Design an enzyme around this catalytic site. Structure first.
Site, PDB file in Angstrom:
ATOM      1  N   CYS A   1     -18.233  49.126 137.423  1.00 57.74           N
ATOM      2  CA  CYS A   1     -19.386  48.772 138.097  1.00 57.74           C
ATOM      3  C   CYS A   1     -20.474  48.390 137.133  1.00 57.74           C
ATOM      4  CB  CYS A   1     -20.179  50.206 138.850  1.00 57.74           C
ATOM      5  SG  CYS A   1     -19.296  50.895 140.064  1.00 57.74           S
TER       6      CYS A   1
ATOM      7  N   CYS B   1     -23.916  53.222 136.004  1.00 54.71           N
ATOM      8  CA  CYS B   1     -22.897  53.951 135.523  1.00 54.71           C
ATOM      9  C   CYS B   1     -21.753  53.138 135.845  1.00 54.71           C
ATOM     10  CB  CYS B   1     -22.909  55.319 136.246  1.00 54.71           C
ATOM     11  SG  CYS B   1     -22.984  55.397 138.213  1.00 54.71           S
TER      12      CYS B   1
HETATM   13  C1  LIG Z   1     -18.676  56.053 152.245  1.00 54.74           C
HETATM   14  C2  LIG Z   1     -17.797  55.062 152.664  1.00 54.74           C
HETATM   15  C3  LIG Z   1     -16.248  55.656 152.608  1.00 54.74           C
HETATM   16  C4  LIG Z   1     -17.826  54.647 154.122  1.00 54.74           C
HETATM   17  O1  LIG Z   1     -17.886  55.645 154.873  1.00 54.74           O
HETATM   18  P1  LIG Z   1     -17.435  55.647 156.448  1.00 54.74           P
HETATM   19  O2  LIG Z   1     -17.163  56.958 157.300  1.00 54.74           O
HETATM   20  O3  LIG Z   1     -16.150  54.588 156.688  1.00 54.74           O
HETATM   21  O4  LIG Z   1     -18.684  54.894 157.229  1.00 54.74           O
HETATM   22  P2  LIG Z   1     -18.892  54.316 158.492  1.00 54.74           P
HETATM   23  O5  LIG Z   1     -19.515  52.952 158.731  1.00 54.74           O
HETATM   24  O6  LIG Z   1     -17.528  54.527 159.562  1.00 54.74           O
HETATM   25  O7  LIG Z   1     -20.047  55.276 159.206  1.00 54.74           O
HETATM   26  C5  LIG Z   1     -19.775  56.719 159.751  1.00 54.74           C
HETATM   27  C6  LIG Z   1     -20.993  57.031 160.515  1.00 54.74           C
HETATM   28  O8  LIG Z   1     -22.198  57.323 159.616  1.00 54.74           O
HETATM   29  C7  LIG Z   1     -23.147  56.617 160.209  1.00 54.74           C
HETATM   30  N1  LIG Z   1     -24.210  55.713 159.354  1.00 54.74           N
HETATM   31  C8  LIG Z   1     -23.646  54.958 158.154  1.00 54.74           C
HETATM   32  N2  LIG Z   1     -24.691  54.701 157.485  1.00 54.74           N
HETATM   33  C9  LIG Z   1     -25.763  54.958 157.976  1.00 54.74           C
HETATM   34  C10 LIG Z   1     -27.282  54.920 157.739  1.00 54.74           C
HETATM   35  N3  LIG Z   1     -27.500  54.412 156.707  1.00 54.74           N
HETATM   36  N4  LIG Z   1     -28.210  55.556 158.547  1.00 54.74           N
HETATM   37  C11 LIG Z   1     -27.708  56.222 159.756  1.00 54.74           C
HETATM   38  N5  LIG Z   1     -26.366  56.368 160.292  1.00 54.74           N
HETATM   39  C12 LIG Z   1     -25.309  55.721 159.284  1.00 54.74           C
HETATM   40  C13 LIG Z   1     -22.489  55.551 161.117  1.00 54.74           C
HETATM   41  O9  LIG Z   1     -23.404  55.015 162.246  1.00 54.74           O
HETATM   42  C14 LIG Z   1     -21.196  56.168 161.528  1.00 54.74           C
HETATM   43  O10 LIG Z   1     -21.741  56.952 162.727  1.00 54.74           O
HETATM   44  P3  LIG Z   1     -20.556  57.488 163.669  1.00 54.74           P
HETATM   45  O11 LIG Z   1     -19.401  58.501 163.027  1.00 54.74           O
HETATM   46  O12 LIG Z   1     -21.139  58.204 165.151  1.00 54.74           O
HETATM   47  O13 LIG Z   1     -19.612  56.159 164.246  1.00 54.74           O
HETATM   48  C15 LIG Z   1     -17.755  53.899 151.708  1.00 54.74           C
HETATM   49  O14 LIG Z   1     -18.810  53.090 152.184  1.00 54.74           O
HETATM   50  C16 LIG Z   1     -17.855  53.978 150.351  1.00 54.74           C
HETATM   51  O15 LIG Z   1     -16.692  54.514 149.995  1.00 54.74           O
HETATM   52  N6  LIG Z   1     -18.956  53.906 149.780  1.00 54.74           N
HETATM   53  C17 LIG Z   1     -19.087  54.378 148.117  1.00 54.74           C
HETATM   54  C18 LIG Z   1     -18.865  53.038 147.345  1.00 54.74           C
HETATM   55  C19 LIG Z   1     -18.644  53.309 146.027  1.00 54.74           C
HETATM   56  O16 LIG Z   1     -18.268  54.481 145.680  1.00 54.74           O
HETATM   57  N7  LIG Z   1     -19.151  52.654 145.176  1.00 54.74           N
HETATM   58  C20 LIG Z   1     -19.096  52.896 143.534  1.00 54.74           C
HETATM   59  C21 LIG Z   1     -19.912  53.962 143.036  1.00 54.74           C
HETATM   60  S1  LIG Z   1     -19.099  54.503 141.315  1.00 54.74           S
END
Ligand SMILES: CC(C)(COP(=O)(O)OP(=O)(O)OC[C@H]1O[C@@H](n2cnc3c(N)ncnc32)[C@H](O)[C@@H]1OP(=O)(O)O)[C@@H](O)C(=O)NCCC(=O)NCCS
Ligand SMILES: CC(C)(COP(=O)(O)OP(=O)(O)OC[C@H]1O[C@@H](n2cnc3c(N)ncnc32)[C@H](O)[C@@H]1OP(=O)(O)O)[C@@H](O)C(=O)NCCC(=O)NCCS
Ligand SMILES: CC(C)(COP(=O)(O)OP(=O)(O)OC[C@H]1O[C@@H](n2cnc3c(N)ncnc32)[C@H](O)[C@@H]1OP(=O)(O)O)[C@@H](O)C(=O)NCCC(=O)NCCS
Ligand SMILES: CC(C)(COP(=O)(O)OP(=O)(O)OC[C@H]1O[C@@H](n2cnc3c(N)ncnc32)[C@H](O)[C@@H]1OP(=O)(O)O)[C@@H](O)C(=O)NCCC(=O)NCCS
Ligand SMILES: [Cl-]
Ligand SMILES: [Cl-]
Ligand SMILES: [Cl-]
Ligand SMILES: [Cl-]
Ligand SMILES: [K+]
Ligand SMILES: [K+]
Ligand SMILES: [K+]
Ligand SMILES: [K+]
Lengths: 393, 393, 391, 391
Positions: D90, D377
């Protein structure tokens, strides 16, 4: 009222040797082993190829084989383009079910001469990827041998784990299963060395450009054994208190078998000597996990149907899917162990699944003495079994 | 003389709607569509589930469906665990061949009540990768629809290119083929509008967690058309003087059909009124490339066998694998085109390959008037065809 | 603040393994750990003195997060050591040394490790994210797609070499003769023991197996000179020139150098091997990558006011025999001073490692006071070059 | 020679697209070209003046040979421009700017482009080279395997953040409050036109359909404040705190800056936006990556002799809301001076791009004479930090 049917006879029964997984016959697709067995059977029967009216072949794992597997085997054996073909899948029972269904067409007088058998090349069974959008986090490539061949849909466990269930229920221990397996290997070696498959098996030449020919003339699996190792092996289908092992279970294999069947009338017309008469057959099914005991009910249905008693049977072929299965059948039917799987079976010879049901019927045809009755039975995934009674002519 | 056989009757014939490729029914496995059609057929027959003794289902592309597809369909429909099952593969003829082989078991008196039909989910057919080592430079995973369903083994060309060969030989031009296709879409729309499928088709509910339910109550494919675009399309299998297009060929589809069959004696015992009598059936084969004309020979065989004339047939169902196939059959048989595929067919309704052979027999069952003869025929990959004659009761 | 002088204190490598050969069980990052550990041991300094690390690595797919960090922690270096992985295709290993030298020159660090690593045996295939197309799915080979294919011209690196062979009139027999010379020189140097201080042995450990010690380069023994002139021209059908024998091969290996400021070397009382004098990058039309090292070498000579005659030893990476012949032709230098102990045509070419290896070879082979010049081409039309002087 | 002064003359980015969203048809390299072309146009210099280019890019698999070279040539820069692709997870986009600054400080180039690019939508799956094992295999997602799994702990970056949440007592509700704050600041800044000099629009052309003009960040509109407290803790079933709403998302984008020496800016009649003062890298235990930016920031302040109070604005990359909260707590800084116009939790996180984006944002948002500090980070336990002053 009962229908009046034509009498059905076996005129010939031929097979390839059975190859080990990724072994001696691994370069040849299932349909080519099918051609070899079919041509062999026609030759041995002493009839023109043009006399065969229709063909049915068992074949469980058809993925990647190309269009119409049975048609490929039939046209590849040099039979007429006028020959209709159907490919049959009753899992491990497919090779027997093909013979049964062909018998039924002959009984109706819908054909007078047919070929029926089974074929499998487990070495060449492919992996699958699903159609659709690739899911986040990974895409699975599943092994079709495991997915379509060996996993019970309903319990979500291997056939081997279903066998463990019956070992528990009927108290059949590791030591008894190992003794049976050693017995199977012993009988296979004896039969082979005595020349007992001299008319049953035909040899196969494997040609590779740049390499010298290889002539495969006997079953490969039965030599792959170490009796001292047998009681040491790990129980692969159940970690806690298991009984089933690689040594006492059937193996994965390649092979094909084919029989020439005809009405009694056609055998007269063509002046061929019939080998055996097909008397009766049946299918039975039970709870999916309980497939090892399904052959018991199928055999019993056949005996009851014809009015015979178990003691009237000279020779039993109960498919050796697992040593456990044969022992379960011996126990429930109360039959003489000396009359069961006399010249070995699937535990030591191997188990090309779509082929085995046809092999065991073909073996009885050759081994029975004049006038004797033989009964062949075979379990299949999903809780089923097929069984067939023949009388040697 | 000739065998004396049990009389075979059709008591019910039911099907799912036919869904488009990746369309309304794409979330359901072939086996689930099978369970739905089988349940429907037993409901419509008005008999206990326990009376069904055995089941055969056509199914061409079995890769990845799991162990014993027919067993999965039957148990998923709530039928007894005692019910033996076999899955049948004669390419596009599968659904019909299942009914034929079941009829043969009934004729022999080996069972008194059976279910037969066919099922296919082309949406869910997977891709394959060879067992072994990946070549340097990569690999293309083959689509099983193309490799197992639609490619002639011997000519190494698509079914559509085989059709072009027949177009040439019999002088069946683009304009005539397009006219037939439009006629099929027209006839399908007319039949749905008139409620001609009321007793034949059962609706299916697709449930997706976290969204409203979708009720599929009619065939999806026939509404996917543009009559003005038809003569403008390019020929998809042969650019050089072609005739076959996406519009005038059958499509890729999902669906299942099932028929309850029993002996005339069983129908009386169970106090059910049969719909039709299965009179005769036959298989024929020609050169692989010439499959479009094989149904001609199979139909002739049937008529000759029973001693009827073509004029005696009130309704013909000649499966619309391609518009070319139907025109080829009309031409050679010299029959009245107003009596052929009167309520549409596979060009407009779709072609889930393992089910169509059963669907068309099922449709004759409902459409015929008391006393009339109906003849159904269906070509298959490798050069074959099946045909069946029924009489309305 | 005035720019600091940079010295090479040690330079170490694994042997180079053949494709799917003797080192194929070890990931690139494990080879990197072995090289790094060996370089620090040779330098005679505590691991804690190494402040930051850069490693070249071209084909990073499937290696896991932060490959250079894996190599560094795997060698037992402190968790406080920042790490960066460098990709300039075949120039990666040399570019890492160059960028580390620049950090040292600015006084931003005083001791660094820099080098390169590659396991071409373990490079995976890829499937695209999305819907599976009707009619079939393609699985591409990352060695071919990311490593060896020119983006703009849509041809293999070997076809780019054929293009230069046409334009500069460098024939098949000439390329074959050079390749035979490379194999001959590699065998001679191994037999003379000229890699005794440069190469460290690798122990390959398998469960229920006797340990296997890999102590020398694998590739140079895989040759049949009588067959060389008979081979097919695999990149071009008509009047081709490039073959499997006269091209570099696919390989596994890692190399690492310990670099210091002049002030740090003195503070730690280490004996430096060589001083880094100058370095440069050049770039030309993508298809013309075989000639980019000519321009990079020219830039470095001009920078410090040296003539080509002042160079004792040249290392022109043997991407193909064609490349070295093109460089010799345009520069007009004495062939007896070029790739004297063999090169990538006979020793192999783990792509992210080679540019570090050739700088490390000069460090050991040059005599006191002599200048060595290393240059290396890269896909896309680039090259890097470095001049060092033996101390 | 003494060290040269380095200035930022322009900083430009694409909008950030959602995973499989508005920019998913464009490869990372194409997004790079768009940002690079925009940065040069804004700088007002001849494109021939750009001497060399470095781009951050973490997930390089399947993008073709030399990703930075593809971005550069695609932007219309000369074939004589050398290119290197940089991977510090990152931190990649920042580390590229730092390394370019060192080359300029040495006098090795006078004008460079540095930045970062990522298309997470187009990252592929991998299959190992070799024989397929009996029983099948799962083809791994490279986002997960190379991007987001810690090698040593064998857990997701999100589970590493859980460890810090437990140690520093930073609760679910506090993390959710910070995330809602980020979404609110992002929307407000877009509505106030605060990205007008920073972001350039992207036209997406599809044969047989009308053009789509992407003119703003896509991710910040994908939120429902009432649902935030209802979500499941996706990285840890029992006693978790990290959710989809309070974590960064997966995204597509690119950013690029033009950097020059002070002498070069004078020569070319360029009025620069800001001066690069100092930068540093820190590293800790891999599981503790959230706290590394504290140490990197403290290093830069100590180096230059500034107090935390002297910083007008902070950009601490929003890898997770947890990371920002931990940094505020340990550094004891005014939360009103931190990620003032939103950050990665609501704008999204194309991982190789974000470290460059945050430096570019400070360049535009700072007032004359003000100091800005950016920190970010990285997986493996690292961080990079940079101090700039607005001119
Ligand atoms: C977190 C991650 C795994 C995604 O998770 P996910 O479960 O596939 O996300 P989804 O889009 O299926 O969302 C799940 C739920 O949260 C809700 N949701 C997601 N973001 C939201 C927000 N900002 N506000 C409100 N609701 C939200 C969705 O509507 C969904 O609801 P549902 O279960 O009723 O359908 C992925 O985005 C990730 O790994 N992020 C981190 C990235 C990272 O690590 N970067 C490097 C940093 S070191
Ligand atoms: C059981 C099965 C999974 C194979 O298991 P496996 O562990 O991969 O088999 P292996 O060859 O690796 O055997 C492991 C060990 O057993 C030993 N072994 C196997 N068969 C042996 C025999 N007949 N005699 C002595 N030793 C034997 C091997 O030497 C090997 O030794 P090792 O642990 O020192 O390496 C597979 O053959 C199978 O699924 N069989 C059942 C088929 C089936 O279900 N058919 C349908 C019936 S309904
Ligand atoms: C022919 C086949 C490959 C589909 O071809 P396709 O090119 O992928 O079909 P598409 O959906 O992309 O349609 C192609 C064009 O025809 C048009 N089209 C399709 N059906 C149409 C109809 N009924 N009316 C008007 N236009 C139609 C589409 O709009 C499209 O137009 P466009 O290219 O200008 O956008 C496939 O349906 C097939 O193989 N069928 C044969 C099945 C078979 O052989 N079964 C076995 C029997 S032996
Ligand atoms: C050239 C390349 C494609 C390999 O081609 P290949 O044909 O698959 O190589 P093989 O191992 O199958 O060799 C083919 C033949 O050459 C022979 N051969 C290979 N090297 C030989 C040598 N040094 N001496 C004699 N014969 C040799 C083999 O014996 C074989 O002979 P055969 O067909 O009668 O059995 C591969 O090494 C390559 O891409 N190299 C270039 C790497 C590169 O471009 N790096 C980046 C630089 S910009
Ligand atoms: Cl046929
Ligand atoms: Cl069954
Ligand atoms: Cl370059
Ligand atoms: Cl780091
Ligand atoms: K065994
Ligand atoms: K159509
Ligand atoms: K070579
Ligand atoms: K979020």
């Amino acid at each position: 009222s009962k229908p009046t049917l034509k009498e059905v006879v076996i005129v010939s029964a031929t097979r390839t040797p059975i190859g080990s997984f990724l072994g001696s016959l691994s370069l040849l697709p299932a349909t080519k082993l099918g051609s070899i067995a079919i041509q062999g059977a026609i030759e041995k029967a002493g009839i023109p190829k043009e006399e065969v009216k229709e063909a049915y072949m068992g074949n469980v794992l058809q993925g990647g084989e190309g269009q119409a597997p049975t048609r490929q085997a039939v046209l590849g054996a040099g039979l007429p383009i006028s020959t209709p073909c159907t490919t049959i899948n009753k899992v491990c029972a497919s090779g027997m079910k093909a013979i049964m269904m062909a018998s039924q067409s002959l009984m109706c007088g819908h054909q007078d001469v047919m070929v029926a058998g089974g074929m499998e090349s487990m070495s060449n069974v492919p992996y699958v990827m699903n159609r659709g959008s690739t899911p986040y986090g990974g895409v699975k490539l599943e092994d079709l041998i495991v997915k379509d061949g060996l996993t019970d849909v309903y319990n979500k466990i291997h056939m081997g784990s279903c066998a463990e269930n019956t070992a528990k229920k009927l108290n059949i221990a590791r030591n008894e299963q190992d003794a049976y397996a050693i017995n199977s290997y012993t009988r296979s070696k004896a039969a082979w060395e005595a020349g007992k498959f001299g008319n049953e098996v035909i040899p196969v030449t494997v040609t590779v450009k740049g390499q010298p020919d290889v002539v495969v003339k006997e079953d490969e699996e039965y030599k792959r054994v170490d009796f001292s190792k047998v009681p040491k092996l790990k129980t692969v289908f159940q970690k806690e208190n298991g009984t089933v092992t690689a040594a006492n279970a059937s193996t994965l294999n390649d092979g094909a078998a084919a029989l020439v069947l005809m009405t009694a009338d056609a055998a007269k017309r063509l002046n061929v000597t019939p080998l055996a008469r097909i008397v009766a057959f049946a299918d039975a099914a039970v709870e999916p996990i309980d497939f090892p005991i399904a052959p018991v009910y199928a055999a019993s249905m056949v005996l009851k149907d014809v009015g015979l008693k178990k003691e009237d049977i000279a020779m039993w072929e109960v498919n050796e899917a697992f040593s456990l299965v044969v022992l379960a059948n011996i126990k429930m039917l109360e039959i003489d162990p000396q009359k069961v799987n006399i010249n070995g079976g699937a535990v030591s010879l191997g188990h090309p699944i779509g082929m085995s049901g046809a092999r065991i019927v073909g073996h009885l045809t050759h081994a029975l003495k004049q006038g004797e009755y033989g009964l062949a039975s075979i379990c299949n995934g999903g809780g089923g079994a097929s069984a067939m009674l023949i009388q040697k002519l």
